[PDB]
Write an enzyme that holds these catalytic residues in place. Structure first.
Site, PDB file in Angstrom:
ATOM      1  N   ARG A  69      -3.542  -6.956 -18.344  1.00  0.00           N
ATOM      2  CA  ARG A  69      -4.782  -6.227 -17.947  1.00  0.00           C
ATOM      3  C   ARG A  69      -4.549  -5.487 -16.697  1.00  0.00           C
ATOM      4  NH1 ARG A  69      -9.557  -8.323 -20.691  1.00  0.00           N
ATOM      5  NH2 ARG A  69      -8.537  -9.670 -22.079  1.00  0.00           N
TER       6      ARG A  69
ATOM      7  N   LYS B  13      -4.912  -3.635 -24.829  1.00  0.00           N
ATOM      8  CA  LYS B  13      -5.794  -3.742 -26.266  1.00  0.00           C
ATOM      9  C   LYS B  13      -4.418  -3.560 -27.112  1.00  0.00           C
ATOM     10  CE  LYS B  13      -9.869  -2.156 -24.188  1.00  0.00           C
ATOM     11  NZ  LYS B  13     -11.271  -2.407 -23.798  1.00  0.00           N
TER      12      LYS B  13
ATOM     13  N   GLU C 153       0.652  -1.263   0.001  1.00  0.00           N
ATOM     14  CA  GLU C 153      -0.118  -0.042  -0.021  1.00  0.00           C
ATOM     15  C   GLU C 153       1.021   1.444  -0.002  1.00  0.00           C
ATOM     16  OE1 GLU C 153      -2.341  -1.187   3.301  1.00  0.00           O
ATOM     17  OE2 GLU C 153      -4.168  -1.096   2.154  1.00  0.00           O
TER      18      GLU C 153
ATOM     19  N   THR D 252      -6.243   1.560 -20.547  1.00  0.00           N
ATOM     20  CA  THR D 252      -6.024   0.199 -20.214  1.00  0.00           C
ATOM     21  C   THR D 252      -4.689  -0.047 -21.109  1.00  0.00           C
ATOM     22  OG1 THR D 252      -7.673  -1.610 -19.991  1.00  0.00           O
ATOM     23  CG2 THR D 252      -6.927  -1.321 -22.253  1.00  0.00           C
TER      24      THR D 252
END
Lengths: 463, 463, 463, 463
Positions: C251, C245, C62, C242
């Site tokens: 991803r 693609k 974190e 993203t």
């Protein structure tokens, strides 16, 4: 085929509209042939009524004096300026440290405009719980989470309460609550609280959580003007009020706000423009100039020696009433009063506020049922001194009112004993009740002995 | 040490408050010694003023008639019921299909209460763009995205506009907008639109996008009552209004709403309870009962043959004024009027609305500057017929008003030619302007020839 | 009774979970025995897959590098720093003018975090309408006002559209819309738009209305990195994407934002801290460190000469496919392409996108049905070049794909002619269709001739 | 000029990206050469890692199995169905009474999607206060009213706390709070609470205030699957979780929800469709299918006899660690544990959590500083057993870890005594500290003696 101006426009009400004229006359008689103990009511002066019913209703004056959108405001400006300067004088406010906006249509719009000025939608507000003596515009949702008050629809509210056993505001729980919920605005003041407020402590709570602090002094504003209760102006950022309760004016609202340097960045207060802009143009249209003229009248009257004596009398009358009630064995919330009202806990008598209110209303004694600390069917009645004190009643007269209330609760118990503890039963005992008709006659006879402001009783259509 | 009731409570205003009394007298003279063309103004009847200024201001009656929280409402209930039944009669409404709430303090609270009743916070609303003749309470934010109107603070608004070249509502763009934005509520009605509304088309747009449809008829409600313009009641779900403009009543508001079976589930309308609850207890406190009594009076007056004739005269006077202006070469938005006002486009003269308004105000001619289609410093003035028509002026009188306006715009151009096109220059040409002092004297002489409702001119303190 | 670490922890998937292992093998065969034309899909490298499936999934980190809440981050910090510096290099961004956050779990969280950083709840957003080629995260509500996209639930959205006849973005309507609605944020980029974007014009519209401007370049980010389409970085404030693609990575999502002095107060950009804080701690927990390592790999690969050639090939393949289709009489939206996809309007054929998609899917040709300008049952199919180009197909291979599509639409029409125009009928014609089984065999044979990244075909369980 | 598929697409990571490959190797060594006590961490199986790093990352499958928007989902559907059915089996859930959605990218998106499904913007939520052991996604704003958590930005949250003296959840104050604030959703579960939850009591509180009840079981989901702690499924409406902590799976999220008839209208639960729709299409795009395959693997592993034994061991190891600490005079919050962690209150030692965390991190002992009841600079450290238990450590091994912690806190006190109580001083005592270098060497030697799941230590690049 138009009617002449004389026919439709200059003819008196008694000819134009007999129906309405007759109904106003009966309301006038009702107002002076009974005992008015609704703590939010008063009988205003004839001077106030003459300003209210004047050609001032014809003038549309959007904006502030000196910054209006249309012409012809020479005299409306002067009335509004006088109304504002008299508002500051009535509450002993230095103009360099306080401003006031006198355009709110009423107290509830004054509150909502104040919120709009300083908060964003969904900001958190805390106010005195309704069941603890607070007011609907301070926030109210039900146990099902249904948002009743507009304050609870457009903002996020959380109520603080009175101590369950003493009936005083629980300042320790208030502080713990405010530190949890972190409200942007804390509201103090209420509708059925019988004690004074510790504004200094509210200021301390507010400072600890970074909140604004607002006082809604609608109920006690008359006592505040006469310096007979604590002044919220010493500690609050904003003070809103209605103008017709203990202040004895027209139906209107005002928003007071701090100006000038802040107390310890060398910063200054920023409320004036936000407040004014919230009233107009955000929420309201043109002001009701007749209300502003009537209010200016009421404020001058509020600044007279006679008004301070009236406020003293209001306090002494409520105290003498409460002491008379407690002498008969009755129990008051907090055991007395420091302001204009008493809150009478009827649960020790096995009675509901509704039952006493209904029977009093049959004797032309108007009180209102009212919740008491931890109620879960309100269990008390709220009784106020301003209206009857305006008719000149002093302590001895309020002791007789206490006797009338005493007689009335006695008739309520006799009914409950004879017919039953269910509301269905209680009603059976009202039908053709001689004893109720006897108290009604005594109340009307006693009521008729006193004078009445606002209209001449020796000109009444019904005597 | 309390003042006797006779001293503070029965004494007339002229003794209690000389300052305020004097200022009301000057306002009374101002109202009858000039030419009042503010389209949102009127001079109400003396009968209305007598109810407004009455002991009805003393009664606190939270709730509805037959469901009040406190006693003593026998006569207030009857006044409110009569006011509601007269409200339905005045607008030719079947009680089985329409209800009305008469407690809104004013028109802007009536609108916001209607919104609260049928919308959730952030629901989408469409209304007539301010610059196209709409009203602030229908939504308004600036080019910087600053939310001005409370309607735009608590809800999501988007304005529709008039066609840029004709000045008529662009119904095709309205429909395209509504199909994109998907408002939950479409508002029609306006403040400075000079034509009638095609409510049928609004209903068609509303049905296509699944919207409620509300008409704010504040400006034309008098014409609506007299059936001199299209009725919004044929097609809208809710109709709000102010009561003091063309309706010639007190300052108050009303919310009309559909009742009974819906048009093509065998379902019924659901507005009555939501509307009433929104007014009280969500937003307002106790109603201003003196306003409700005054309004009841105004509604009866509105239902008289003389009122239909007055509404016809208002329309005929605005038309005869407009034709007189256009005969002098002036240009009106849409080239005429179908209601109570004309919108005068001053851009073809090289003039700003402010300049004409300022100079008219120096001659006791009160109009207001007003935006015109595509303005980007408003470029027009808005002139209305209701007030002067209430004083009995007919078409020949409004042609003389047109001449006075013509003289005034002529003096404005002569100033602009001599001193300059900058506002700084224009002001230089007002100082000790003989020609302005001459028009002022003619206006005051012409104004003084007509009667005046609400107060007797032969009792005025200043003549 | 605990299992030894070797048994549960070191044993391969093929032994631990035969079911899942078998299903992955079939998916591997499916991916290389058909024709993949989903424009949002790609086949990533084996190197990317090795980083993704690594012990990096075990580390919880974190915070940001250099400001973490827990220890042991020496090597995770270095991977994240390398991933960020490679992200700036891949898009030719100066680190003094641009920053990037690589922690978004995916593209849709990257968008929502960007919104959260720069907007307040209910702020207005405009994005490309879904039916015009936009994306769900840019805003979407239905005609009934049902809010589908979370962007439309927590913010106020309004879509802009393409011209109804040409299929290009209507920049004039975009500007008129933005000046009406006054969005705080305008989104450009889309999912099924076949042309480049005029970011300069978007910047002009944004500047005129005081809006932030964000590009979602998810679909074309690979083309952007290789500088084969216009760069949004020249004109937008924020760029989200993203990473899987046309960028051919894992991803994941990224948010790019401007840093340093603003263009013409001597002010600097304020996005870095807001963006980072929005990702963590407001919305996300610990990042998926395996994704960040895989993404770092993909970004280095994206910065190679071979990747620019791949992006050129993607563009040339889509163009050669579209030209082949149009040569057969087919119609493309805008009549061609400038990027990785073609949008095929099937309405001139009397066909629905669903019918062609279903029949193609029966021949192992995966396209997707897609709306076309003014659709009111989508009427087109969307076809993309990235995936098959990653397998090494060049223009001649994409002409053969066009022939396969041509054969498929021919079979769709023959079915529609024989069995009927209703969906019920069309399905009857799929049962035991020899001709469909013949195209399927040719597609599988053609598909099998090319290589496949990410896994070795000569190690497949199913060949 | 395109690279061959073999070159860019089939080449291993160690050749494609030496930098990233080297960094992963060092992270692999770090993970097995130290003592990992971060309670939110685990070491997952190699089988999980093989599914996670697979061609499943290439498939875009928006929608649910059986209702997808594109073709080619034959095998992805089967993987998702198996993952869901295994999710229900792992937690002993009847499919007629429970459904699950396995698409959330992570635990924090699972929570926010659950909120979106059942709440409207600004609905009220209650969760365990951060300082009392709760989680950021359950709500968090600061004392200045700054909204940190997205849960607190888009919804209205209010935290409940643990008792100030015992460290257990104060169920009486929870109930009083919920009856005041009236939340629409109460959240239970936490990040640093060392005791079990009384879900029955939460259900009682929820029923009394009309709230939904949700458990975030992220931390204890492994213990829940093995039925070693109370099941939230007996009393909660919705259960969310992360899948990588005590569950020992990949990084992913799940949302469980009740189905079928409600307990005492003959009504049925309404969560399934809302939950699924919130995940997609409202918030997420296509799912991370490699995560879903890895998760399916983890769920089968979670349902094995060895996993129940592992969960028993986790609990026994934390208990044996706690007893060892308390035997040395140390104080734990609540005096022990019932789950996977201990919370060590360092305030009785005059130490801050940061100081112990920093020095432990220098010896390759990763714990995290953590707040303790009433902290006002966190005063504790949070230590968890799952990760080291996954490496096969049993109670005797956790007693040795306790000795290492004991040695470490001793070195921390010796530093504070010699150099000072200010953070500036403490740092001076770390430089070239022989004693710290000695504990580090012992930790690394002890750490190296155990096995390691997920990768083979006898294939490590660094030994």
């Amino acid at each position: 085929h138009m009617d002449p101006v004389s026919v439709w426009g200059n003819t008196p009400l008694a000819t134009v509209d007999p129906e309405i004229h007759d109904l106003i006359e009966k309301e006038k008689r009702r107002q002076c042939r009974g005992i008015e103990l609704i703590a939010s009511e008063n009988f205003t002066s004839f001077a106030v009524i003459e300003a209210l019913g004047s050609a001032l209703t014809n003038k549309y004056s959007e904006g502030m004096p000196g910054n209006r959108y249309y012409g012809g405001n020479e005299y409306i400006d002067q009335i509004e300026n006088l109304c504002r300067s008299r508002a500051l004088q009535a509450f002993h406010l230095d103009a360099q440290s306080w401003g006031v906006n006198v355009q709110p249509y009423s107290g509830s719009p004054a509150n909502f405009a104040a919120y709009t000025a300083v908060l964003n939608p969904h900001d958190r507000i805390m106010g005195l719980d309704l069941r603890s003596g607070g007011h609907l515009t301070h926030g109210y949702y039900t146990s099902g989470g249904k948002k009743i008050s507009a304050t609870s629809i457009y903002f996020e509210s959380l109520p603080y309460k009175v101590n369950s056993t003493t009936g005083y505001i629980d300042y320790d729980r208030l502080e713990e609550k405010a530190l949890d919920f972190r409200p942007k605005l804390i509201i103090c003041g209420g509708s059925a609280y019988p004690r004074d407020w510790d504004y200094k402590r509210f200021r301390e709570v507010a400072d600890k959580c970074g909140a604004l602090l607002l006082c809604d002094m609608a109920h006690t504003s008359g006592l505040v003007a006469a310096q007979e209760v604590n002044s919220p102006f010493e500690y609050c950022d904003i003070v809103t009020t209605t103008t017709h309760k203990s202040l004895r004016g027209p139906r209107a609202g005002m928003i007071f706000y701090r100006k000038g340097p802040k107390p310890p960045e060398n910063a200054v207060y920023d409320f004036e423009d936000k407040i004014n802009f919230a009233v107009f143009p955000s929420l309201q249209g043109g002001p009701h100039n007749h209300q502003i003229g009537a209010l200016a009248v009421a404020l001058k009257q509020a600044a007279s020696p006679g008004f301070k004596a009236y406020a003293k009398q209001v306090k002494a009358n409520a105290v003498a009433l409460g002491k008379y009630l407690m002498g008969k064995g009755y129990s008051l919330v907090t055991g007395g009063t420091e302001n204009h009202l008493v809150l009478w806990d009827l649960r020790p008598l096995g009675l509901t506020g509704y039952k006493v209110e209904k029977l009093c209303d049959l004797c032309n004694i108007t009180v209102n049922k009212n919740a008491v600390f931890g109620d879960s069917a309100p269990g008390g009645v709220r009784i106020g001194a301003p209206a009857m004190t305006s008719r000149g009643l002093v302590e001895k007269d309020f002791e007789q009112i206490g006797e009338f209330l005493h007689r009335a609760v006695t008739l309520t118990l006799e009914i409950q004993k004879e017919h039953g503890k269910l509301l269905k039963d209680f009603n059976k005992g009202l039908v053709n009740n001689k004893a109720i008709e006897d108290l009604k006659a005594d109340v009307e006879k006693f009521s008729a002995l006193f004078d009445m402001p606002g209209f001449l009783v020796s000109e009444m259509k019904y005597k």
